[PDB]
Design a protein around this ligand. Structure first.
Ligand code: A1ILW
Length: 148
């Protein structure tokens, strides 16, 4: 599950949850657990950062990728990977997609698929082996975050 395709599906499932367009039919047990936890983080970040989230105009996918790179470089600067930081990656892509829905020039219905790709690239290349060694999504993330 630490392969790119699995991570891409998690990132895309979370953007479809934020955008209220879940793929008709349903998400896996991993995505279901992740959407509750990442949404709780997302809402608190949006409340705390309300003032500064207006300091950018996310007019394009390249702007969103630049912002994502800056935020992730800062989030992981101490070299510490943990599950909280992994959930924060998904919460942050949720904030990005909401700003793109409002601000993207020539809004493209497939944009969430491009954001999903670069989120999955970051997760796989920068945290993938930490994730696998800590149980992957099914034996790590879900075991940590699934309901008591
Ligand atoms: C006011 C802040 C600001 O100007 N920008 C910004 C910076 C960071 C950010 O989100 C980060 C991800 C969520 C949060 N981290 C966090 O809660 N980490 C905790 C400690 C480790 S843990 O995982 O346990 C939890 C901060 C923002 F959403 C916004 C801007 C930064 C920039 N590079 O311009 C900014 C970025 C993006 C947008 Cl859309 C708007 C402003």
């Amino acid at each position: 599950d630490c392969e790119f395709g699995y991570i891409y599906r998690l990132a895309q499932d979370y953007l479809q949850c934020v955008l209220q367009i879940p793929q008709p039919g349903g998400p896996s047990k991993t995505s279901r657990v992740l959407q509750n936890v990442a949404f709780s983080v997302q809402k608190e970040v949006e409340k705390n950062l309300k003032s500064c989230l207006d300091n950018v105009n996310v007019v394009s996918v390249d702007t969103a990728r630049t912002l994502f790179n800056q935020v992730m470089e800062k989030e992981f600067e101490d070299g510490i990977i943990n599950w909280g930081r992994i959930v924060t990656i998904f919460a942050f892509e949720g904030i990005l997609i909401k700003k793109l829905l409002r601000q993207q020039i020539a809004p493209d219905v497939d944009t969430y698929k491009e954001i999903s790709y670069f989120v999955a690239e970051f997760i796989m290349n920068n945290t993938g082996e930490w994730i696998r060694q800590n149980g992957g999504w099914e034996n790590g993330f879900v075991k940590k975050f699934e309901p008591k």
